[PDB]
Design a protein around this ligand. Sequence first.
Ligand SMILES: [Zn+2]
Ligand SMILES: [Zn+2]
Lengths: 386, 35, 552, 626
Amino acid sequence: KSAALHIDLCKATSPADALQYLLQFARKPVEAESVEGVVRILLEHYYKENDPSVRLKIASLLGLLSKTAGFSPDCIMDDAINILQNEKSHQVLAQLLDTLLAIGTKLPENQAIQMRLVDVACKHLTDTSHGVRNKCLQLLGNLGSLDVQKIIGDYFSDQDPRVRTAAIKAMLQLHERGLKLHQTIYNQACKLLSDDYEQVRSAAVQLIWVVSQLYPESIVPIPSSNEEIRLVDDAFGKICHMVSDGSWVVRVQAAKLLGSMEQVSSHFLEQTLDKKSGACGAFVHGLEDEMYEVRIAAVEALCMLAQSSPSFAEKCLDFLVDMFNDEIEEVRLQSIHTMRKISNNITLREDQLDTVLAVLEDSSRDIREALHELLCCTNVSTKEGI
Amino acid sequence: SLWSNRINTANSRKHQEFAGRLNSVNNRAELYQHL
Amino acid sequence: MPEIRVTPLGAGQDVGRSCILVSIAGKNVMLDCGMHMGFNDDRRFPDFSYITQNGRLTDFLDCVIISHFHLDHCGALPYFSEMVGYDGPIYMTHPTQAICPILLEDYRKIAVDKKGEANFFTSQMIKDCMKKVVAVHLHQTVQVDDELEIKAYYAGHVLGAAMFQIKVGSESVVYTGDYNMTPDRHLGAAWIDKCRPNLLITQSTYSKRCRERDFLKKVHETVERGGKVLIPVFALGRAQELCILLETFWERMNLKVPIYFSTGLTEKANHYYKLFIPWTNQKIRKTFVQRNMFEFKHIKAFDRAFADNPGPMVVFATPGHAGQSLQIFRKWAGNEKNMVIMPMQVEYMSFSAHADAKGIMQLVGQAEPESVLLVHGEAKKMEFLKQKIEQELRVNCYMPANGETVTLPTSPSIPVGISLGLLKREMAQGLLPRLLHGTLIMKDSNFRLVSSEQALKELAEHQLRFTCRVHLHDTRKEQETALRVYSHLKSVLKDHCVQHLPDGSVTVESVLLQAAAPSEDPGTKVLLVSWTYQDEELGSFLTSLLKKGLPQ
Amino acid sequence: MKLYCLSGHPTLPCNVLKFKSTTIMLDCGLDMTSTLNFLPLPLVQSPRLSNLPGWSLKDLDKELKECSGHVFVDSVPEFCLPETELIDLSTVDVILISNYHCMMALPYITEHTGFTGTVYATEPTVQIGRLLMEELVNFIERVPKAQSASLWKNKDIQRLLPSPLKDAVEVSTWRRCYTMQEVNSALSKIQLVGYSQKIELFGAVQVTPLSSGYALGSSNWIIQSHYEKVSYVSGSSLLTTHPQPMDQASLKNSDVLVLTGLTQIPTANPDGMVGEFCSNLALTVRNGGNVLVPCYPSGVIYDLLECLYQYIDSAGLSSVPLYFISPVANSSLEFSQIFAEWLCHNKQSKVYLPEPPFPHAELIQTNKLKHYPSIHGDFSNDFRQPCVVFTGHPSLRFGDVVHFMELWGKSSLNTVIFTEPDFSYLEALAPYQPLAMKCIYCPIDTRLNFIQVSKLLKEVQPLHVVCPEQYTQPPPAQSHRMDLMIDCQPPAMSYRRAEVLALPFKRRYEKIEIMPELADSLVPMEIKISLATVSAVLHTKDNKHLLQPPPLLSGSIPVEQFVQTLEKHGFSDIKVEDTAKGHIVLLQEAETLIQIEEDSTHIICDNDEMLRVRLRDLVLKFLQKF
Ligand SMILES: [Zn+2]
Ligand SMILES: [Zn+2]
């Protein structure tokens, strides 16, 4: 039923009654032919109306209507972008770009609409309001592929941190969609990793891990000195320095990406595990942190890193032994699990062995059976150990 | 001359010094001098 | 010549009697009121001869701050407050304000038992001074009168330890009193955001879980065999940390040996610690719902009247001070079944109550200050870390001695206003490295940098329209001349404006060309070119280019 | 500049305010009065509710159950949300929670909307809110009644329903209780804040909470851009209450004032009804009956216990026990103890001495109060009959209070005493209506009444006031008492649910810094105001604008002094004459003409470079640098 809308909405009042009725309509689903009818009449009322908030609601439910399951949205999309060009209100423009993003998600097959939406996104990318740029960047990330990379990377230096975060997440979205990235954006990532707004740093450390995975054997020189070094190892150094950052969520992210990376030379692993450039003693800082989430993430990163590099496993055994006296029982249980995973191929010495065994008196039966499971996989040096 | 008048207004609004600063020598002053 | 003027009366190159006077902008702020443990020949108190001689103090000092309840950071509070006669604001955290009175009264008991009684204070002065203090919450900005703000962060030295950020105008100085980024069992690590201050004051007086494991192994072995342990601990923070560590170890091991403590002082400290839980570890805060960690079942008396046998009993003590009955080693014991941990088993365990070099380096990197100031430690170690800061972090530092005025230059920023129309136009026109030409109506201490047109109402935008005349001998059509001049300029000037104008005129940048009426002489024809100071550099070249003239 | 009012409830307000380049959603209140239309959730199913008769509309009869001529839906209680579809919640950036009463519905917004921003709330607000959501969930899912009531929500079908259901608003938007997974997930996204803490929001906006005084943790928010201060007064209290008192000083010089959370039933003095509550329970227990007090686990129970524990010792009622049965009873009591620094001056003075702030620790130590996590834990064995029992939910639609009403409802010697005013008391007893057990409506609301808000408003003096429309029209029960009105020199514009307000507080200035390096590169000249001009370059980072080193034309030249100064420096043949389009001064030395009209001064000269240089230098010498 759409003729009812055709009567009542043009015979209503402007400020709130139209808005309240429009809100009422959003709670019922629509059928595709009626979807075409409603997008047509809503475009008509969008033409006639001048209020910003009512147009914002018009656009947001137009986006909710395009989300409907079965229909073709391109035909109405043509006129939709036709009016998007002359629209001036910034909130309404951001909402329109939300809808066109919804159409791009809806129909990712036709390339014609893809280039079209990329063109309109780049057209409105000079907008002052940060929300419109946010939606432009989301549109670039979701739709594109093989000119988008340099466009998004130019917005890495945008003043608003929300815009920078959206740009980085757009590149991450592009890589997730399966594009080979560039080695150039490493520098811009490094720049943003240096003093930003927490969310930006979290997304940036995600991005620098992504490019490190993409170009691990590449060569990038030291900025001050002249010594060459494989790219993945300086990426490891840059991520490792973020373990000391004052935002615990970024610390957790950095620990997870530390665990992910595996092509690191054992030199830097020994450097980052030894207590007594900026990648010295990062893991000990992670294990000596106050957030148990950071410690769990760090010990899991230790498990994965030792699993990838068998020779690394010898140096972390004693540190894991200390974690069996941890305060949080989940941390102790996780350290026991890591030890069982990595002590498979290596040997314990006497002091480490008895310190492992001395915690058996603990009341928590779960860590007791976990420790038993460790002992199924441990290796003993001398018969006195047994 | 906006730097000069603003800096003069800011410095002139200062109210009172104290014993150690005027009598300091080489940016340092001695304590417990009564001995 | 603006400045930040700083003078440490104490703890500049020593440990003890933290007292640093600060002048940031006109106002004078006093940083700590500690006392010097060691000498008692009137160097036990700060020398206020720097700032006053037979007079009142509040005339100069605008605030007094306390880092924490340590005697070397707050012990000289009542003497300076009432004995010398300070009657102004005092700011310290709530747990510091709660713990400081009884500790200072115990030190006053110590002094009167040593019988100072010659330059010392009494309990009633403490009761008077403590009514004069204004407590500060964590992360709370305290505007005092009109422009000075004080913000207190977390430090982790003790319960209620804080590092302060004193602000006036755009200039700030961060005083990291006493901290340690190696968090203990019962407290978190110091955190301060990227405040990027113009001055940072830091203390510099210098396998933790491995040490804790060794301690607990010794305790477990002794109570298993039957050794009667003893812990002569002076610090209340260290005592409470050892208490919670022993409590959690015994809870994990599920054994029922008793633990003792001082009936008088430790009871009050435990009560206050239980009260002030949100300052503690995140583990303690998270586990507080299930049960109370400071309501530990091992809350036994001082002893079983000093007759609990030398077996597996556990106790607490203090070194040569007001602690608990160490009736363990000599009264009981006398044999192998005893172990005394004083920082028949002799041992000494070192606990990181104060910070290390790496923690200081991390703090300075985290804050990112313009300058660093060092206090509270051994001068050799100050030199060591000053060399480390100058080498690694490439930031200037100062090392002061007592009575040394470290003074720093400043770069205050002038806050002024903009018209949002001009700002919006500048952003809109610039984002698709040019200049921003504006005009400021610097009124009586209230500035306003607006566009020129905005000044019209306040008359005073009475426009000054310029015009430079160009001598051209041609008499051709206006539209043809304008089109040819536009094409010639687009050829000469490299892509300034490529556009067909509606009125058949010329304008490059923001100049204005008019084919005005010529003079009274019939043999003279002149073209006129109007512009502004913004575009005069191109307008002069445009007029010099057209000085040759169109083809006559 | 634009205010979006998601929820129309006066005391549970969800408002999205788009300020400058940001947007902040103030409070997230869950309109919980919707549950009153539902049948309660008895812990043990009772024959009385089970054998209730269905309401035959015209034939669906199983869907509605009728009690005492009042129709209730037979399903799990459902809660009304803020109007979420009005504004895309992905666009909002920050959520500010004033008090734990507005803390609810946060899981709805945070998980079910794609919202990704942050939340700022005080530490006691977060902890008490966690307990409140925990106990509410534990009440809802304890005896899960199947969700079946959806056919009654249809429009025409709802029209035929009677008055208790006819007035239900946004019925389709009503949602079941969130799970504990949603509560735990949502509460992870909160940054704890402290009173009077300047929290930057991308630089463009600074938000500062201030002690509200209504409850521990409760805060009032102020939003600034160094030129546009926007206050937000949620529920507050000027009375002699134990939390930290109102800080009206920080509220001053406010451009607008979003005012919410005033007193329900403002006719009542709180202390008089505290006395009425104590006296009523006293005569009840002395008669022999039992007293049931449906209360929130943390809201008003602390001061109530204070007054009651004074009263029983004074009146020798120490014989009777005090039962506080709630799943979060112990946690609420301990949280109340440990939050001494968030209290008023007297309590923190008490904790300066070795003493807990609240007295119910002494009540437990004297073994008068006896809290329990549930009826069946140990209260099922330690309970003696003449007693006072603080439990459950004040909605009376879930919790242990429901079982207690079904238990003591039959007798007349017992009594229920209501304290919470946010639920209509006559609607709460409606599903248990044919009961002989005495009900007392003595609300203990401590919010700002209209005379206190009038005094507050006249002290702070905001340029505008934004309030719910319920505060601009007199309450329907009164409808003639104009003392329950808010008035000012502005008319204090209002808002209904799902309404947008355009504000006139769109002042057009922004602060900007200049360092001495660029300050020294400016040339002022005052003529009594300083007339100065600067052409510099603007670089903006993180919504903070800065000017770095890399003019304009303005001036009023009278003709006569122009001529005199030119003659003084030395020049020839300067005219004074009055022609059309303005007075014009002529300089025929090298064909230079200057026209002086009003608001403009046209200057004509030639391309002779040194003539132009000399003229510019001389004019800028006489005309002050501008
Ligand atoms: Zn200390
Ligand atoms: Zn110290």
